[PDB]
DNA sequence: TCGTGTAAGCAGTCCGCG
DNA sequence: GCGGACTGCTTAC
């Protein structure tokens, strides 16, 4: 097999290097790399080293990194360019794996922790490390294997033995539920003491040294604990066995309000998979607990125990041990559901970097953008200072607040990226300039012709069409992968519609469910099969697609971020190809797009219509458009179709058939305009939107820009079982919103949308009644905290004291003195709930730490002194009047002239 | 919240608005 | 009360 890396480093003079080699096998090198980098040169000079503009370099070979380093340092005292990869291990793999990496996951040792410690004064401090490590559970993944290291004799308590017997049984039998497919997989070690346990577990380091190292705020707690714990029993020398190559640092991890500190620990690539989660995701959630992440990602219930966690281990040890192996294996299952360390991994692999570089679009785009260069020989400039300039976005246009009942939707593929290739945008393409007019005269194609001779955007620039420039070259790259994945994604998604359309009608019978590839769409003979299957087979079936379908997500939702993330990074100081004219170049290419189409657009839906200057462009943001189709189904009359189906189809063929191609006509004219490259603004139909045939629902509505609601039936092509709501920006979607709120508001809108005005009303009126039953996490606001210290004085609000930190500096009072009630983190999320007036705590709100039961010292004067008016009409009620506004409609029935029979 | 970008919505504070 | 200037937070893209 063709060898890969597991980690680099540079240490010294030295590149440490664990990897793969070609039998298979893991080794570890270390090696002297003499880097090179490159000064401009004469032209007179001979060379096959030229600079992404063309002028002539000369390598230069260092002795050694220091000597190179030193070197930049005096060029920069000189005042001249030094060019090529000043990461020196970038350089390293670059030249150790000149081909594209075929990496085996199976040879990757992925390794998934976490610890237990027994504090009785309060959350115990990574950097202090003062109470025992009572446990550790560490799952290797070469050997498919749980190690657990179990203390049973602390200064917090002697226990006994945690028995593997009692993990297995049923919560009902008095047993934990560790789940039985792990059971057989549980390798239990016991331990008389902590230096021994400590002793034992970095012997088993050394013997399965992890390459990748994940878990649940591994890098932020377990990592540091673990660390400064060996310190402080053992000195610093044992400690560093945590890194292979026995080097590590503390990393300063700085933001906006404060900083942290973080182990580095060299030769082991950390991807802690609360990170993972929080870039890979695409979800805000009130809270970031593993209980809060798995339940919403799993359906597992809470892992339930009585009393504090600080008390847990002393009186119930079995299932104190028991529940750190389960956190473990909900990480496990996470991933397995969501496969971010396989995309860590492709992606780390594509740009050959160090795996926990894929944070990082910059550091990842530099080095795609740098291997690509180095191919030709060419050789990458010098990262330069910028200050911090704003610069302009898309466009967003104002909607008309109001109902809108039939809606089609279009969109533009992979926008940002395609203006990328499309204009032929890069460092090394720049033409020059042309004089601009105001954008409104490019929309409206009266403005002179940028250029004759170069593609150009309406921000100015003008760029070279010979020749694709890196940028360009390298997005494509992506996009093409980008583009596979969203295939199967859509394919899963299809095939559960079939699914649960079958479901509609279960057979009788015992069988199981078909071997199935769901990433394509399911055959006529496969469809035959599932409409004779059980409902057990069935559902069985359905998870798998819903799976596949996540599995798809994450592979193009990401390789989607990456390569808008290059658009981006143009305009991030610290990228090597800062330029914000390129930057520029894309939004207001962008802003030009979405305006010219929506003119576009109108026309040839006026010149179908027969009418003049209306319009039926109802709405864009960036790449959309919304264009109200009412005209066209009252053309052929509501009474002509058979079901709702029967004009969705209709709308469908109208938007493939004729809206379509006018609209590709409508950019192939723009492209001319531009003199662009290539012409790669692809804007096909996204939804189909509407009431239900013969109903009172509304269909749609907007309240104003980014908030609006629609009912849709199709969506790029997935033609649902049961209509589906598409809401944006409203309450419903926001993380602030309480979850009860969240859920009355999106029922609140389906009736708007599907049923109308009475069915509106009908459950406004039993929502109102009945809301005060509602269990008070459940109707708790959310926000993330940030600045407690700033707006905190002796412990009461300063001026201009956010409403959320008021209540935070309540709870503060209210627990003051108790050094082990639970403490708001900064920059955390907390609930929030409104107080009445003349409450015990003093203030009009209460805050606590989010995805918590707050602290039973004050659980009962808080549920006693809830403020629900409040809370109803802040939360529930100011939205809905919104929505309803909008949709010119009444969530209250208004008096009439009947009510005096 | 260490980690690519801008546009833009709503909650809330402070305080004007005769 | 509402609305502007401002901070804070959270979305859509
Ligand atoms: N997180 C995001 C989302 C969007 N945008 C920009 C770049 C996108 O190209 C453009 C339009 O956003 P879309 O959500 O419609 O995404 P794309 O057009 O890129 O991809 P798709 O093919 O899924 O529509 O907005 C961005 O910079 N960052
Ligand atoms: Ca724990
Ligand atoms: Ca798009
Ligand atoms: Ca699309
Ligand atoms: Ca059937
Ligand atoms: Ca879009
Ligand atoms: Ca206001």
Redesign the pocket.
Known sequence: MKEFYLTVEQIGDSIFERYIDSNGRERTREVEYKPSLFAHCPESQATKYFDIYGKPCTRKLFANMRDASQWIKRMEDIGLEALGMDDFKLAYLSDTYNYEIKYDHTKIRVANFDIEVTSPDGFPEPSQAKHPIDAITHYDSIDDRFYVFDLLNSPYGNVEEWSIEIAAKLQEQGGDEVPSEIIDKIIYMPFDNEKELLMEYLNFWQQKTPVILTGWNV??FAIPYVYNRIKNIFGESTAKRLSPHRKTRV?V????????E?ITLFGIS?L?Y??LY??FSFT?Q?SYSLDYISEFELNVGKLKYDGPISKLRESNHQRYISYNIIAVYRVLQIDAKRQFINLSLDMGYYAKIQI??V??????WDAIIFNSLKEQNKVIPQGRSHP???????????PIPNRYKYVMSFDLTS?YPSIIRQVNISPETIAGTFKVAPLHDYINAVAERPSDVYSCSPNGMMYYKDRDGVVPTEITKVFNQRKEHKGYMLAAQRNGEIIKEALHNPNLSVDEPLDVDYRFDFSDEIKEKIKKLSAKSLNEMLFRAQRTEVAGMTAQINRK?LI????????????RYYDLRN?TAI?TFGQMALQWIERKVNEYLNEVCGTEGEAFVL?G????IYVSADKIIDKVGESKFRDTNHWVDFLDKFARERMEPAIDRGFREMCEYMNNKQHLMFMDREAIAGPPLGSKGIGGFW??????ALNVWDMEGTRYAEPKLK?????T?????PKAVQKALKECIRRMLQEGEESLQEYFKEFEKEFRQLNYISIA???????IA??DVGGF??????????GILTYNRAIKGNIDAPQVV????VY?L?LREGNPFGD??IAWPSGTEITDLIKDDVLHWMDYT?LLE??FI??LE?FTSAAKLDYEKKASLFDMF
């Open positions: 890098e932020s990393k991890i700085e933001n906006m309000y404060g900083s942290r973080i950390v802690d609360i990170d929080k870039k805000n009130p926990q570089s944070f990082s679009p910059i550091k990842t911090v300039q704003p610069y302009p976005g898309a466009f967003v246009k104002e926008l971020a808008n993330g290059l658009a981006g990074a143009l305009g991030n100081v610290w990228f930057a939004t709405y943001d960036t790449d959309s309240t104003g820009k980014k908030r609006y809401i944006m920006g409203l309450e979607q926001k993380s602030s919103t606001s959310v926000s993330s905290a940030n600045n700033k707006y609000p300063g001026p201009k004291c956010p409403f959320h930190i008021r900064e920059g955390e999320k929030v409104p009009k709100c409040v802040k939360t100011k939205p919104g």
